[PDB]
Design a binder for this molecule. Structure first.
Ligand SMILES: Nc1ncnc2c1ncn2[C@@H]1O[C@H](COP(=O)(O)OP(=O)(O)NP(=O)(O)O)[C@@H](O)[C@H]1O
Ligand SMILES: CC(C)c1ccccc1-c1nc(NCc2ccccn2)c2c(ccn2C)n1
Length: 317
């Protein structure tokens, strides 16, 4: 009559199965030092078909596809992520579902976003362009760090999943959250949004709260240098409607009790500390997103957008 209920979601369970399988398969294939053109058009497909052989945590009919496995393994290596840590981060403990289809890893190092067939097509277009860029900058970017790309099939229903390094902290929680475009038009969080514990604020909210960012000229000249060449790369690709995602962690408010002889096992690669002498001690998490890569459940000329965007972001400091 009504829909079926499960203790474990099928899609997620197949996904974590597939990642295990794919990293296991990859450990038996020496990583090339040089990627070839064909690697950007490569895929791994597996179809499981069990008759009358019933499992709890896993359906009986399902498919898993990994896109460009040698490319993403190479990206992981350039971003300083060993396949074993990736696998552990994603499978050891189950991932926490956040808001439609958007997952954080138990350790909070990785984010997993469901995306469209359309978005997979876009990913493939610029993947070789992106890999070239990552080589040039030695993985030092404010762009998303794409670590894997997969299609899960349950019920004859294809879900596309994208794995990214978390722009936010492996533990330091985020108190204030902005999406900034520097748009000619006004941008503001709805009444329905400011109603949430962590609402996605915007350009007018930032200005209306006279919000600034205090980091210190040296960490600023390091940030704006990187931001410029990242945005220049996006111009070459004729990409436009992107934002700076800005997370503020307030030091004094601190973390929940579940943060004696324990050191952080991960680095927050988009994090930058309050410089000495500043209204409040804080950590800033700043990276580049668009509608495709926004930390949310998926629902004018490039050079102008660029010049404009860099104008607005240079003024938040
Ligand atoms: N190598 C590729 N290069 C560019 N776009 C691709 C590539 N593979 C898939 N796409 C696109 O990405 C989206 C997802 O395609 P997908 O569901 O993987 O189809 P498929 O590979 O043609 N099917 P199948 O043979 O069953 O694996 C669609 O928009 C595809 O056209
Ligand atoms: C450079 C870009 C990150 C990228 C890398 C690898 C492979 C593909 C892409 C890409 N990224 C899109 N959006 C996501 C996005 C854009 C800007 C900033 C942050 N995130 C794309 C396309 C094509 C259309 N769109 C909307 N290509």
């Amino acid at each position: 009559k009504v829909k079926v209920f499960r203790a474990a979601d099928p899609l997620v369970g197949v996904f974590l199965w597939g990642v295990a399988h794919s990293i296991n398969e990859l450990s038996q294939v020496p990583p090339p030092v040089m990627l070839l053109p064909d690697d950007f058009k490569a895929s791994s497909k597996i179809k499981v078909n069990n008759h009358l052989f019933h499992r709890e945590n896993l359906p009986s009919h399902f498919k898993f596809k990994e896109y460009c496995p040698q490319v993403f393994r190479n990206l992981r290596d350039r971003f300083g992520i060993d396949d074993q840590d990736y696998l552990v981060s994603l499978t050891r403990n189950p991932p926490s579902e956040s808001e439609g289809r958007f997952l954080i890893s138990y350790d909070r190092t990785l984010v997993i976003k469901e995306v469209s067939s359309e978005d997979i097509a876009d990913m493939h277009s610029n993947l070789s362009n992106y890999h070239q860029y990552i080589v040039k900058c030695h993985g030092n970017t404010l762009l998303p760090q794409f670590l894997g790309m997969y299609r899960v099939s349950v019920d004859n229903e294809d879900s596309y999943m994208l794995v990214m390094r978390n722009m936010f902290s492996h533990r330091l929680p985020v108190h204030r959250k902005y999406d900034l475009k520097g748009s000619l038009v006004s941008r503001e969080a709805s009444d329905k949004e400011k109603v949430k514990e962590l609402p996605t604020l915007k350009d007018m909210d930032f200005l209306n709260k006279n919000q600034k960012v205090y980091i210190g000229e040296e960490e600023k000249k390091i940030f704006l240098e990187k931001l410029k060449r990242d945005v220049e790369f996006l111009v070459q690709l004729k990409i436009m409607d992107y934002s700076l995602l800005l997370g503020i962690h307030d030091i004094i408010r601190g973390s929940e009790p579940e943060e004696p002889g324990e050191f952080e096992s991960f680095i927050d690669v988009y994090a930058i500390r309050s410089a000495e002498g500043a209204p409040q001690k804080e950590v800033y998490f700043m990276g580049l997103i668009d509608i495709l890569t926004q930390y949310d459940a998926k629902k004018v000329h490039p050079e102008q957008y660029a010049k404009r965007f860099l104008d607005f972001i240079t003024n938040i400091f």
